[PDB]
Amino acid sequence: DQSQIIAGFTLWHLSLPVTGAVEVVVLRLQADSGAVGYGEASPWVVFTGSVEATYAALDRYLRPLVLGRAVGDHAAIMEDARAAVAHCTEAKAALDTALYDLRARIAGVPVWALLGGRCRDRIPLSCSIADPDFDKDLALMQRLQDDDVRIIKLKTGFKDHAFDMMRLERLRADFPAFDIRVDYNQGLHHDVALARVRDVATFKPTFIEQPVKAHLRGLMARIRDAVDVPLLADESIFGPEDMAEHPEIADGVSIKIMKSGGLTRAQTVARMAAARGLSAYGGDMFEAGLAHLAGAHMIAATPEITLGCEFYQATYFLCDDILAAPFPVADGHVLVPDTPGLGVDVDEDALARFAV
Amino acid sequence: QIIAGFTLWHLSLPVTAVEVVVLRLQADSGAVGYGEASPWVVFTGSVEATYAALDRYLRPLVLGRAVGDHAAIMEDARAAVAHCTEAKAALDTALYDLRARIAGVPVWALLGGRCRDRIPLSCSIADPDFDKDLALMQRLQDDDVRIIKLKTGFKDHAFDMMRLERLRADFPAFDIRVDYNQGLHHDVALARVRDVATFKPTFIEQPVKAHLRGLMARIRDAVDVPLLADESIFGPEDMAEHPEIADGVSIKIMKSGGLTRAQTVARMAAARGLSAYGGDMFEAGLAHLAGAHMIAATPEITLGCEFYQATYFLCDDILAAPFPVADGHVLVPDTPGLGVDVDEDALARFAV
Amino acid sequence: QIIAGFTLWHLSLPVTAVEVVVLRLQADSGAVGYGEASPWVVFTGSVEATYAALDRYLRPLVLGRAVGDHAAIMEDARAAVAHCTEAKAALDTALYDLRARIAGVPVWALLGGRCRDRIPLSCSIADPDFDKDLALMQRLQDDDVRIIKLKTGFKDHAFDMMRLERLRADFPAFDIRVDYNQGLHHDVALARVRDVATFKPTFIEQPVKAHLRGLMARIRDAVDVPLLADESIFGPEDMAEHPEIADGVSIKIMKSGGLTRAQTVARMAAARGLSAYGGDMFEAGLAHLAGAHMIAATPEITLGCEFYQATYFLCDDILAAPFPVADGHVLVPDTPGLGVDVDEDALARFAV
Amino acid sequence: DQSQIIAGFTLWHLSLPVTGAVEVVVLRLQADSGAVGYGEASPWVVFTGSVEATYAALDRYLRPLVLGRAVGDHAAIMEDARAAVAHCTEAKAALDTALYDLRARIAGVPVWALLGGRCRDRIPLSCSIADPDFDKDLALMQRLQDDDVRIIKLKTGFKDHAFDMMRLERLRADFPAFDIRVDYNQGLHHDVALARVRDVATFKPTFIEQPVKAHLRGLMARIRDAVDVPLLADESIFGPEDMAEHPEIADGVSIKIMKSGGLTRAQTVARMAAARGLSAYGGDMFEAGLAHLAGAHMIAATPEITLGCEFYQATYFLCDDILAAPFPVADGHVLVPDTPGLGVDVDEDALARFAV
Ligand SMILES: [K+]
Ligand SMILES: [K+]
Ligand SMILES: [K+]
Ligand SMILES: [K+]
Ligand SMILES: [Mg+2]
Ligand SMILES: [Mg+2]
Ligand SMILES: [Mg+2]
Ligand SMILES: [Mg+2]
């Protein structure tokens, strides 16, 4: 049964409205038996690559390498997948996710059971605070507080520095029970980055994420050493190779299956970080509930990821998701399913509704 | 469902004796999984240390746990008892075997799926009577085995140089590696490594004591032939701490404390262009199968494996059918669990 | 004056097929400029990624801009879309071609003026049938070409060593370089590089995967023959980050994302005594001309160029007259723009 | 037309009175067609070399390498120029400037169009505050404020430390809207440099420039790491070779065509700095409007230079300039011309009036 072939390979390019729209690609794999598995690719054109690049990677270059293969050859399929097309880590993540979802459903086990088993069944949730209209986010904070969410990440550097400092002050004043992180999304020019980081460090955020452009890894290392607050690398480190090459550039790493090109490789990044005493955090892209579930299963199997996750978009940002039931969140945590595969069905009618 | 039973055997296994410890785990449903710990007292620690790790300290953290909590159980296991990586490997192996059998999948399906169904086999050449080993070689050659690892530095340097010349002369189709097992004193290690390197072995493994990692790094940089670390690197933490001491690493589940961690060492090595080889201890077939499933799911381990003891060294194994080898390769099973039944009668027979 | 038009062709070009994307930019006045993107899916990214970069993401940042704002446009282009350095090179090339034609100057007059009017040419030797390549060599020798780059590591090591010995024997007047295209596994890379170094190629290019830069640095320091980085270094940021991984760099506009940035890589290399070579991808004559004008204005690129595909590899090119080569050199034009007309009929003919 | 020869090579050694005098050398190149281009060399004897060295470099050693060459061979002329005479980067800059001005005027394009095109058409201006009579500079500050200049650089270390601290205090008090930088011009002895730098850092200047002697690059690196305020290298880094050799000695670099030996090389220094996250600033020497225009065109084509420029001398320091019209400044910015060549004509009658 482990040599049953992959007989179907189907793509949807979606546009999903948000409270704007975000574009993702969904992959379904179908085995010889008729069993199916799904994966999501969630690109950001300025950071990981375009949606068109990811679609083409799947449609033209991965498809002929996947169709007709033995589904048990998952590990060899993914080595071939990495060799076949440069970049498109999001596309690779979709493939890895669909292969895990498929083999898990065939076996009748949850995806985490294929990643080493479970160390946790809940994962603390962080919501991002990113609105240029801060009164709208103050409204959101009331809802988060009532929902028992107790972590947020302030997106900083996109308006001006006074806007960042104003929001940090007000959130610390009005919402002291919250654990607050900061994410610059590569948004500080090297002229001002250290000074701005030192200023926001005065509010003692749990971490400050990726202040400078991804390639400025030497400057990241300098900022790490200059400031007491933990520095987190995001766009500076995609996968194990980057982690190996740049061991000392930050105090921790944001783990995203869309950067690492899948679930197995995300685990490897987090294990490499932990082995030297670097923190690991469950980051995400502009994703839907399918990609969220993939990340949640990965985190459930990875004790090294201890800083929570930001799988908030399906619950708080997307007008409608693509799952058949609500992405599972209660009491400020993601609830990791224990039913087969990713644990919540993909709604193909929603795939059809949102297809471009 | 919960782990309802936890059973240990301390075995003594005659050879052509080695002591191992076998663990059986039993779920609520009656399903079972097995693992083997294979300690070497001078290297990984005593068999008594390993037995006590399992019997006293791990037993209570494992009995009554949900089998699905495998990852948490192993975190707890690492925190519960220092060393005894062999014990921890036995537990990891049993947990994978048990979960794979409950699910009806081979253990490699729990480790990422498969990248290879066959692994090239190496047999060790370590007899003080070299004529016997020359007989062994003919059998290896008839068996289509095409890799050997010469154990060096236990007699004298002339004995090692003699054997290398003879083997290159009379068996030129063999891929030859060298393993010193920490046996060269620092006074002479560089000189002797340079001498054996003239036979271009594929690698030279662990010339000096495990803790002499600065010297390992010097030997790495002095000689063109790849240097392989063994005892100097156990798990991911050692790999993270000592990134440049060698050109590659011997991956052993008994050093890494399990299957998952062994994968992580190989991946960490590969990420920087260091090689990975499927090493082993004085193990029986149960251990061999655990290592075989690990290698089957780990593309980074490209240098073969040395799972030769169940075939050429043990009088009798503890599996119900032979450990699967043919045409000089280990044949990775695709049936459920580790893929060959453990023979509980063989367990009773060889229990101390 | 403003950029009033932005047009793309996705081409498939038969070879003795490769896909490229051509961009035409059109100013208010009707003046036009062209650029080529030549992607390699395993190396720089897909042709689809490049087409989308231009069609969706760059088009709106370019249409309606003042042509004189070239430097700002390219800043915006780099910020707008990750990767797709081939797309960005096509845009840079079109912007230079258009501005040079508006001004009535060759593109090299926009890049610092000229330091050379001729560039030594290298042709690649990459046929699995070596007898065919031995025929190709006679033609190269009759054409006064005196540099070749042997593509290695795609068959086996004996095939590479065989070809080197034969070429040194039968064609001793040729400057021979070697290119592995990331093709040596880390298990064997040092050994094989050392072996091919015995033929003293002028350089050995990119033996290992692009990300294995620590290993590149080790190979650099282990072997006397110059090591050339290709895929390991794309633009100035990579050059700044990895200063000591090689003895020199292959400069390609399709990696650097343009003409200016390619100059900057060469200058950064030269400042510390690293060499620079005029590399290329599977390009047509438009790309060749962009690279040729770049090299003409960049004294630091002293190792020749490999703009051989339009002459010896493509069945038909997309220029209205032949890409200019004579006496084993590229002949840098001094007429306006890139210096040879793009044939829009050839564009229509080969569009997918 | 690109092979038309350089047929004329003419030098003037000027002395230009200032609110003292400054000595510069002007070069005019004349092509076969009669078109002309001009460049300026602006030496400082203690820093870059004497005016006599620069004059001789042009008159005896560069002249025979330039006369009769094809003007299109600009890049080869400048390689030959660098090989021909040691030092005299100012002389080399004059030659590079005149070649660009000449080819630009022949082509009918502005100089920046020969340097990659334009990224900005205005450049924020900084004026230096360097008078031993501080009341005179307080007068100047009223004029700067009314002129909408909002950057100054305080020259420090030439009187005593209390004088520096007094001026910083008063400027921060009376002119809070100004961005203030500090420049020591190599003026701190190594015995006291760190302590003095730490003291002036308390006023949070945007950068502190070259506290110690140029060769003390190890001590510069120590000062960089000891103080939060950005350290700028000036005399420690001339061109790309220095930049390559000394990558970590400061947080940024002052780019001056008179150090880099021309416009192309200045751009290369700024691109090398930016590639690793080091700042770049448009510095100058005691220059006239010709050299200012050269630097302004260079900066217009170089997005990496983001800290402004100090092309203030033609407007605020020289009693009379050598251009046919006022060096273009409005609203606190240099206005980069878009007409051919450097964009403002050189007044040869002014060359004659000021010749020694
Ligand atoms: K820190
Ligand atoms: K070695
Ligand atoms: K070398
Ligand atoms: K500093
Ligand atoms: Mg982030
Ligand atoms: Mg060993
Ligand atoms: Mg190449
Ligand atoms: Mg200065």
Coordinates of N, CA and C in Angstrom, one line a residue, chain A residues 15-167:
Chain A
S15 N -8.1 33.9 -4.5 CA -8.0 35.3 -4.0 C -9.1 35.3 -2.9
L16 N -8.6 35.6 -1.6 CA -9.4 35.6 -0.4 C -9.5 37.0 0.2
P17 N -10.7 37.5 0.2 CA -10.9 38.8 0.8 C -10.6 38.8 2.3
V18 N -10.0 39.9 2.8 CA -9.6 40.1 4.2 C -10.4 41.3 4.7
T19 N -10.4 41.5 6.0 CA -10.8 42.8 6.6 C -9.6 43.7 6.3
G20 N -9.0 44.7 0.5 CA -7.9 43.9 0.2 C -8.3 42.4 0.1
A21 N -7.3 41.6 -0.5 CA -7.4 40.2 -0.6 C -6.0 39.6 -0.5
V22 N -6.0 38.4 -0.1 CA -4.7 37.6 -0.2 C -4.8 36.5 -1.1
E23 N -3.7 36.3 -1.9 CA -3.7 35.2 -2.9 C -2.9 34.0 -2.4
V24 N -3.4 32.8 -2.5 CA -2.7 31.6 -2.1 C -3.0 30.6 -3.2
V25 N -2.2 29.5 -3.2 CA -2.4 28.4 -4.1 C -2.7 27.1 -3.3
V26 N -3.7 26.4 -3.6 CA -4.0 25.1 -2.9 C -3.7 24.0 -3.9
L27 N -3.1 23.0 -3.3 CA -2.7 21.7 -4.0 C -3.5 20.6 -3.4
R28 N -4.1 19.7 -4.2 CA -4.7 18.5 -3.8 C -4.0 17.3 -4.5
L29 N -3.5 16.3 -3.8 CA -3.0 15.1 -4.3 C -4.0 14.0 -4.1
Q30 N -4.1 13.1 -5.1 CA -5.0 12.0 -5.0 C -4.2 10.7 -5.2
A31 N -4.4 9.8 -4.3 CA -3.7 8.5 -4.4 C -4.6 7.6 -5.3
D32 N -4.0 6.5 -5.7 CA -4.5 5.4 -6.5 C -5.8 4.9 -5.9
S33 N -5.9 4.8 -4.5 CA -7.0 4.3 -3.8 C -8.2 5.3 -3.8
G34 N -7.9 6.6 -4.2 CA -8.9 7.6 -4.1 C -8.7 8.6 -2.9
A35 N -7.9 8.2 -1.9 CA -7.6 9.1 -0.8 C -7.0 10.4 -1.3
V36 N -7.2 11.5 -0.6 CA -6.7 12.8 -0.9 C -6.0 13.5 0.2
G37 N -5.1 14.4 -0.1 CA -4.4 15.3 0.8 C -4.3 16.6 0.2
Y38 N -4.2 17.7 1.0 CA -4.2 19.0 0.6 C -3.0 19.8 1.2
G39 N -2.5 20.7 0.5 CA -1.5 21.7 1.0 C -1.7 23.1 0.4
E40 N -1.2 24.0 1.2 CA -1.3 25.4 0.8 C 0.0 26.1 0.6
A41 N 0.1 26.9 -0.5 CA 1.3 27.8 -0.7 C 0.9 29.2 -0.5
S42 N 1.5 30.0 0.3 CA 1.1 31.4 0.7 C 2.2 32.4 0.5
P43 N 2.4 32.8 -0.8 CA 3.6 33.6 -1.1 C 3.3 35.1 -0.8
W44 N 4.4 35.8 -0.6 CA 4.4 37.3 -0.5 C 5.4 37.8 -1.4
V45 N 5.0 38.5 -2.5 CA 5.8 38.8 -3.6 C 7.1 39.5 -3.3
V46 N 7.1 40.3 -2.3 CA 8.3 41.1 -1.9 C 9.4 40.3 -1.1
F47 N 9.0 39.2 -0.6 CA 9.7 38.4 0.5 C 10.1 37.0 0.0
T48 N 9.0 36.2 -0.3 CA 9.3 34.8 -0.7 C 9.2 34.6 -2.2
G49 N 8.5 35.4 -2.9 CA 8.3 35.3 -4.4 C 6.9 35.4 -4.8
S50 N 6.6 35.6 -6.1 CA 5.2 35.8 -6.5 C 4.3 34.6 -6.4
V51 N 3.0 34.8 -6.4 CA 2.1 33.7 -6.6 C 2.2 33.0 -7.9
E52 N 2.5 33.8 -9.0 CA 2.7 33.2 -10.3 C 3.9 32.3 -10.3
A53 N 5.0 32.7 -9.6 CA 6.2 31.8 -9.5 C 5.9 30.5 -8.8
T54 N 5.1 30.6 -7.7 CA 4.8 29.4 -7.0 C 3.8 28.5 -7.8
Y55 N 2.8 29.1 -8.4 CA 1.9 28.3 -9.2 C 2.6 27.6 -10.3
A56 N 3.6 28.2 -11.0 CA 4.3 27.6 -12.1 C 5.2 26.5 -11.6
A57 N 5.8 26.8 -10.4 CA 6.7 25.8 -9.8 C 5.9 24.5 -9.7
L58 N 4.7 24.5 -9.1 CA 3.8 23.4 -9.0 C 3.3 22.8 -10.3
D59 N 2.8 23.6 -11.2 CA 2.1 23.3 -12.4 C 3.0 22.6 -13.4
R60 N 4.1 23.2 -13.7 CA 5.0 22.8 -14.7 C 6.2 21.9 -14.2
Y61 N 6.7 22.2 -13.1 CA 8.0 21.6 -12.7 C 7.9 20.6 -11.6
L62 N 7.0 20.7 -10.7 CA 6.8 19.7 -9.7 C 5.8 18.5 -10.1
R63 N 4.8 18.9 -10.8 CA 3.8 18.0 -11.3 C 4.4 16.7 -11.9
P64 N 5.3 16.9 -12.9 CA 5.8 15.7 -13.6 C 6.7 14.9 -12.7
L65 N 7.1 15.4 -11.6 CA 8.0 14.7 -10.7 C 7.2 14.1 -9.6
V66 N 5.9 14.4 -9.5 CA 5.0 13.9 -8.4 C 4.0 12.8 -9.0
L67 N 3.4 13.1 -10.1 CA 2.4 12.2 -10.7 C 3.0 10.9 -11.0
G68 N 2.4 9.8 -10.6 CA 2.9 8.5 -10.8 C 3.9 7.9 -9.8
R69 N 4.4 8.8 -8.9 CA 5.3 8.3 -7.9 C 4.6 7.5 -6.8
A70 N 5.4 6.6 -6.1 CA 4.9 5.9 -5.0 C 4.8 7.0 -3.8
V71 N 3.7 7.0 -3.1 CA 3.5 8.0 -2.1 C 4.4 7.7 -0.9
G72 N 4.8 6.5 -0.7 CA 5.8 6.2 0.3 C 7.2 6.8 0.1
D73 N 7.4 7.3 -1.2 CA 8.7 7.8 -1.5 C 8.8 9.3 -1.2
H74 N 7.9 9.8 -0.4 CA 7.8 11.2 0.1 C 9.2 11.8 0.2
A75 N 10.1 11.2 0.9 CA 11.4 11.8 1.2 C 12.2 12.0 -0.1
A76 N 12.2 11.0 -1.0 CA 12.8 11.2 -2.3 C 12.1 12.2 -3.2
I77 N 10.7 12.2 -3.2 CA 10.0 13.3 -3.9 C 10.5 14.7 -3.6
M78 N 10.6 14.9 -2.3 CA 11.0 16.2 -1.8 C 12.4 16.6 -2.1
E79 N 13.4 15.7 -2.1 CA 14.7 16.0 -2.6 C 14.7 16.4 -4.0
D80 N 13.9 15.6 -4.8 CA 13.7 16.0 -6.3 C 13.1 17.3 -6.4
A81 N 12.1 17.6 -5.6 CA 11.4 18.9 -5.6 C 12.3 20.0 -5.4
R82 N 13.2 19.9 -4.4 CA 14.1 21.0 -4.1 C 15.1 21.2 -5.2
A83 N 15.6 20.2 -5.9 CA 16.5 20.3 -7.0 C 15.8 20.8 -8.3
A84 N 14.5 20.7 -8.4 CA 13.9 21.0 -9.7 C 13.6 22.4 -10.1
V85 N 13.5 23.3 -9.1 CA 13.1 24.7 -9.3 C 13.8 25.5 -8.1
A86 N 14.4 26.6 -8.5 CA 15.0 27.5 -7.5 C 13.9 28.3 -6.8
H87 N 14.1 28.6 -5.5 CA 13.2 29.4 -4.8 C 11.8 28.6 -4.7
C88 N 10.7 29.4 -4.6 CA 9.4 28.8 -4.5 C 9.3 27.8 -3.4
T89 N 9.8 28.3 -2.2 CA 9.7 27.5 -1.0 C 8.3 27.3 -0.6
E90 N 7.4 28.2 -1.0 CA 6.0 28.1 -0.7 C 5.3 26.9 -1.4
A91 N 5.7 26.8 -2.7 CA 5.3 25.7 -3.5 C 5.8 24.4 -2.9
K92 N 7.0 24.3 -2.6 CA 7.6 23.1 -1.9 C 6.8 22.8 -0.6
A93 N 6.5 23.8 0.2 CA 5.8 23.6 1.4 C 4.4 23.0 1.2
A94 N 3.7 23.5 0.1 CA 2.4 22.9 -0.3 C 2.5 21.5 -0.6
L95 N 3.5 21.1 -1.4 CA 3.7 19.7 -1.8 C 4.0 18.8 -0.5
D96 N 4.9 19.3 0.3 CA 5.2 18.5 1.5 C 4.0 18.4 2.4
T97 N 3.2 19.4 2.5 CA 2.0 19.4 3.4 C 1.0 18.4 2.8
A98 N 0.7 18.4 1.5 CA -0.2 17.5 0.8 C 0.3 16.1 0.9
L99 N 1.6 15.8 0.8 CA 2.1 14.5 0.9 C 1.9 14.0 2.4
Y100 N 2.1 14.8 3.4 CA 1.9 14.4 4.7 C 0.4 14.2 5.0
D101 N -0.5 15.0 4.5 CA -1.9 15.0 4.7 C -2.4 13.7 4.1
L102 N -1.9 13.4 2.9 CA -2.3 12.2 2.1 C -1.9 10.9 2.8
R103 N -0.6 10.8 3.2 CA -0.1 9.6 3.9 C -0.8 9.4 5.3
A104 N -1.1 10.5 5.9 CA -1.7 10.5 7.2 C -3.1 10.0 7.1
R105 N -3.8 10.5 6.1 CA -5.2 10.1 5.9 C -5.3 8.6 5.5
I106 N -4.4 8.2 4.7 CA -4.3 6.8 4.3 C -4.1 5.9 5.5
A107 N -3.2 6.3 6.3 CA -2.9 5.6 7.5 C -3.9 5.7 8.6
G108 N -4.8 6.7 8.6 CA -5.7 7.0 9.6 C -5.2 7.6 10.9
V109 N -4.1 8.4 10.7 CA -3.5 9.1 11.8 C -3.4 10.7 11.5
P110 N -3.3 11.4 12.6 CA -3.1 12.9 12.4 C -1.7 13.2 11.8
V111 N -1.5 14.3 11.1 CA -0.3 14.6 10.6 C 0.9 14.6 11.6
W112 N 0.6 15.1 12.8 CA 1.7 15.2 13.8 C 2.3 13.8 14.1
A113 N 1.5 12.8 13.9 CA 1.9 11.4 14.1 C 2.9 10.9 13.1
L114 N 3.0 11.7 12.0 CA 4.1 11.4 11.0 C 5.3 12.3 11.2
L115 N 5.3 13.1 12.1 CA 6.4 14.1 12.4 C 7.1 13.8 13.8
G116 N 6.9 12.6 14.4 CA 7.5 12.3 15.6 C 6.6 12.1 16.8
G117 N 5.3 12.3 16.5 CA 4.3 12.3 17.6 C 4.2 13.7 18.2
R118 N 3.5 13.8 19.3 CA 2.9 15.0 19.9 C 3.7 15.3 21.1
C119 N 4.1 16.6 21.3 CA 4.5 17.1 22.6 C 3.6 18.1 23.3
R120 N 2.6 18.6 22.5 CA 1.6 19.6 23.0 C 0.4 19.4 22.2
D121 N -0.8 19.7 22.8 CA -2.0 19.7 22.1 C -2.7 21.0 21.9
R122 N -2.1 22.0 22.5 CA -2.5 23.4 22.4 C -1.2 24.2 22.1
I123 N -1.4 25.4 21.4 CA -0.3 26.3 21.1 C -0.8 27.7 21.4
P124 N -0.1 28.4 22.3 CA -0.5 29.8 22.5 C -0.5 30.6 21.2
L125 N -1.6 31.4 21.0 CA -1.8 32.2 19.8 C -1.4 33.7 20.0
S126 N -0.7 34.2 19.0 CA -0.4 35.6 18.9 C -1.2 36.2 17.7
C127 N -1.8 37.4 17.9 CA -2.5 38.1 16.9 C -1.6 39.4 16.5
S128 N -1.5 39.7 15.2 CA -0.7 40.9 14.8 C -1.6 42.2 14.9
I129 N -0.9 43.2 15.3 CA -1.5 44.5 15.5 C -0.8 45.4 14.5
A130 N -1.5 45.6 13.3 CA -0.8 46.1 12.1 C -1.6 47.2 11.4
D131 N -2.7 47.6 11.9 CA -3.6 48.6 11.3 C -3.0 50.0 11.3
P132 N -3.0 50.7 10.2 CA -2.6 52.1 10.2 C -3.6 53.0 11.0
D133 N -4.9 52.5 11.1 CA -5.9 53.1 11.9 C -5.9 52.5 13.3
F134 N -5.1 53.0 14.3 CA -4.8 52.3 15.5 C -6.1 52.1 16.3
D135 N -7.1 53.0 16.2 CA -8.4 52.8 16.9 C -9.1 51.5 16.5
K136 N -8.9 51.1 15.3 CA -9.4 49.8 14.8 C -8.7 48.7 15.6
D137 N -7.4 48.7 15.8 CA -6.7 47.7 16.5 C -7.0 47.8 18.0
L138 N -7.3 49.0 18.5 CA -7.8 49.0 19.9 C -9.1 48.3 20.1
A139 N -10.0 48.4 19.2 CA -11.3 47.6 19.1 C -11.0 46.1 19.1
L140 N -10.0 45.7 18.2 CA -9.6 44.3 18.1 C -9.0 43.8 19.4
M141 N -8.3 44.6 20.1 CA -7.7 44.2 21.4 C -8.8 43.9 22.4
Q142 N -9.9 44.6 22.4 CA -11.0 44.2 23.3 C -11.5 42.8 23.0
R143 N -11.7 42.5 21.7 CA -12.1 41.2 21.3 C -11.1 40.1 21.6
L144 N -9.8 40.5 21.5 CA -8.7 39.5 21.8 C -8.7 39.2 23.3
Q145 N -8.8 40.2 24.1 CA -8.9 40.1 25.5 C -10.1 39.2 26.0
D146 N -11.2 39.5 25.4 CA -12.4 38.6 25.7 C -12.2 37.2 25.2
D147 N -11.5 37.0 24.1 CA -11.2 35.7 23.6 C -10.1 34.9 24.3
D148 N -9.6 35.6 25.3 CA -8.5 35.1 26.2 C -7.1 34.9 25.4
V149 N -7.0 35.6 24.3 CA -5.7 35.7 23.6 C -4.9 36.7 24.5
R150 N -3.6 36.3 24.7 CA -2.7 37.1 25.6 C -1.3 37.3 25.0
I151 N -1.2 37.2 23.7 CA 0.0 37.6 22.9 C -0.4 38.4 21.7
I152 N 0.3 39.5 21.5 CA 0.2 40.2 20.2 C 1.7 40.5 19.7
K153 N 1.7 40.8 18.4 CA 2.9 41.3 17.7 C 2.6 42.5 17.0
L154 N 3.2 43.6 17.4 CA 3.0 44.9 16.8 C 3.9 45.0 15.6
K155 N 3.2 45.3 14.5 CA 4.0 45.5 13.2 C 4.4 47.0 13.3
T156 N 5.7 47.2 13.2 CA 6.3 48.5 13.4 C 7.1 48.9 12.1
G157 N 7.5 50.2 12.0 CA 8.3 50.7 10.9 C 7.6 51.0 9.6
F158 N 6.3 51.0 9.6 CA 5.6 51.2 8.3 C 5.0 52.6 8.2
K159 N 4.8 53.3 9.3 CA 4.3 54.7 9.3 C 5.4 55.7 9.6
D160 N 5.6 55.9 10.9 CA 6.8 56.6 11.4 C 7.1 56.1 12.9
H161 N 8.3 56.5 13.4 CA 8.7 56.0 14.7 C 7.8 56.5 15.8
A162 N 7.3 57.7 15.8 CA 6.4 58.2 16.8 C 5.1 57.3 16.9
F163 N 4.6 56.9 15.8 CA 3.4 56.0 15.7 C 3.7 54.6 16.4
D164 N 4.9 54.1 16.3 CA 5.3 52.9 17.0 C 5.4 53.1 18.5
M165 N 6.1 54.1 18.9 CA 6.3 54.4 20.3 C 4.9 54.7 21.0
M166 N 4.0 55.4 20.2 CA 2.7 55.7 20.8 C 1.9 54.5 21.1
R167 N 1.9 53.5 20.1 CA 1.2 52.3 20.3 C 1.7 51.5 21.3

